[PDB]
């Protein structure tokens, strides 16, 4: 498994 919260946070908040 892998958290959608974790992956989406990085996706929407990357520089």
């Amino acid at each position: 498994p892998s958290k959608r919260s974790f992956i989406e946070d990085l996706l929407f908040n990357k520089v």
Partner: antibody, heavy 132, light 109 residues
Framework: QVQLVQSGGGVVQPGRSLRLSCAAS????????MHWVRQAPGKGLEWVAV????????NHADSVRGRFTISRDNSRNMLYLQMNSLRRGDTAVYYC?????????????????????????WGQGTTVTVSS | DIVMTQSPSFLSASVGDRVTITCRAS??????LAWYQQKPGSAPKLLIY???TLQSGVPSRFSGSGSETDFTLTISSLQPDDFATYYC??????????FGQGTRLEIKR
């Protein structure tokens, strides 16, 4: 049976504000990101905003950043666009759209299944006319 | 932001013809490119995603190809239902998304 039904547009004066609604049904609304896209009379499609499955993350296009706010209420299967500081250039048909999931995945599989695969179901569109 | 440039802006064909419309990204977008069809007064319809895979329900005469910066939509035997405006859309820079300017496919006479 998968469907988006929009309501709430019309004529508004510049500077004023409007809120568009988009009611989803036939699918697990809270499992998918949702988008707004608009089309000014006689012109092409312009992407407006996206919101993540549970409302925590969101992004708006530069043309509307700071004026429009996307939001969602998953307990009522509702997507919203709050449109403030309206300009004549915001005159368009506004569509809500569901994020498409790659056919080979029945559940969320990060970038394998979601985000990158377009938008499969669309609302009927709402006309917003910004004018003095 | 990535700019998508469709060509041509307008083109004419008859029923039975083959039609190719292209779309170019201002930088590489891998294969994260979708195509849509739209008729006046209706919402856009998703035709192809991930550059080449056909959306369920879309006739097989539609096909997509391309990668990195150059992409094409091909309709192999034009039918009356196919006259419309077509848009490409890149999703590589998710969560910001951009559309091409559209291609209008009208009836030759």
């Amino acid at each position: 049976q998968v469907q988006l039904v929009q309501s709430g547009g019309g004529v508004v004066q510049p500077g004023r504000s409007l809120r568009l609604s988009c009611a989803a049904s036939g699918f697990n609304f809270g499992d998918f990101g949702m988008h707004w896209v608009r089309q000014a009379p006689g012109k092409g499609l312009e992407w407006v905003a996206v919101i993540s499955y549970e409302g925590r993350n969101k992004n708006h296009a530069d043309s509307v950043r700071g004026r429009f706010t996307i939001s969602r209420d998953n307990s009522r299967n509702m997507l919203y666009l709050q449109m403030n500081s309206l300009r004549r250039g915001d005159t368009a048909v506004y569509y809500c759209a569901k994020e498409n999931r790659d056919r080979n995945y029945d559940s969320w599989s990060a970038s394998y299944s979601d985000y990158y695969y377009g938008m499969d179901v669309w609302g009927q569109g709402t006309t917003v006319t910004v004018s003095s | 932001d990535i700019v998508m440039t469709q060509s041509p802006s307008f083109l004419s064909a008859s029923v039975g013809d083959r039609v190719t419309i292209t779309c170019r990204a201002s930088q590489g977008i891998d294969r994260y490119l979708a195509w849509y069809q739209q008729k006046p007064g209706s919402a856009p319809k998703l035709l192809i995603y991930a550059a080449s895979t056909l959306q369920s329900g879309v006739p097989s005469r539609f096909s997509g190809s391309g990668s990195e910066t150059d992409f094409t939509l091909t309709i192999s035997s034009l039918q009356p239902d196919d006259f419309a405006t077509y848009y490409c859309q890149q999703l590589s820079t998710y969560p910001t998304i951009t559309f091409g300017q559209g291609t209008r496919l009208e009836i030759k006479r």
